[PDB]
Structure 1
């Protein structure tokens, strides 16, 4: 029994992002979603063949929210003391070393994570093996 905690199957209603209308045609419009406010916009009027709109019905199961495909919840660590906070939660959470953590501090985080039994999502970033 060395894995994530037993969870329900991970079901995602949608995998495609909600692209903003006319973001394909104009380079000044980002793909981040904006609600169209025109009274005759086909996306707002919900015609067929048009881009869908975000709604609360697309929301994910609460027992599966914020959960990685492995079944662990992401936990941003910055040092060794952040790893020891997952001593009681080694099967619910996984350690994510931050992008600002240096090379030698990642060594101490990786060594402590293996001892505590927590997963690391970024375990081969600035490190290499020596024989």
Structure 2
């Protein structure tokens, strides 16, 4: 069973004038200018982040697979979610070595925990190996 996840807006709320100037990044900032075209919500430029875009509470922070992300660092952190394998998916942290990644991936199979980084830091065994 997996509920239908509804995203009210899949675009990005890019900062005003970020498309014209390289010094202005794309991370959102509220236009506070007295004469600003966007904060006055003129026609055409009337797109600001509001709480009305908030996604449903039931499916908020839900991965496309229907589970939730649980960052793990070693084999013991898998035991924290072994009782909720239908709710949480493992996610090995970016700094975990390739050797420890094998133990986390191997143990998660035993405890039936889905891992979303199951193909990360694989050894040279792709071509002719």
* TM-score in same-fold range (> 0.5): yes
Q: Does 1:120 align with 2:115?
A: yes
Q: Distance in 1 between matches of 2:10 and 2:23?
A: 25
Shift of 1:86: 1.0
Q: Which residue of 1 aligns with 2:54?
A: 59
**Counterpart-to-counterpart distance in 2, 1:46 and 1:20:** 14
The corresponding residue for 1:39 is 34
From 18, 25, 35, the equivalent of 1:23 is 18
Residue 86 of structure 1: aligned partner:
81
Greater relative contact order: 1 or 2 (C-alpha under 8 angstroms, separation 6 or more)? 1
The root-mean-square deviation of aligned C-alpha atoms, in Å, is: 1.6
State the Cα deviation string for residues 43-102 of structure 1 (Å, max 9, x = none).
101111115000000001111011001100011111111111111110111101000000
Question: Conserved in 2, the CA contact under 8 Å of 1:13 and 1:60?
Answer: yes
Gaps of 5+ in 2: none
Rounded to whole Å, the distance in 1 between the matches of 2:97 and 2:46 is 43
Contact 2:39 2:46 in 1 (8 A): no
- Alignment-derived partner of residue 101 in structure 1: 96
Matching residue of 2:43? 48
Note if 1:72 corresponds to 2:105: no
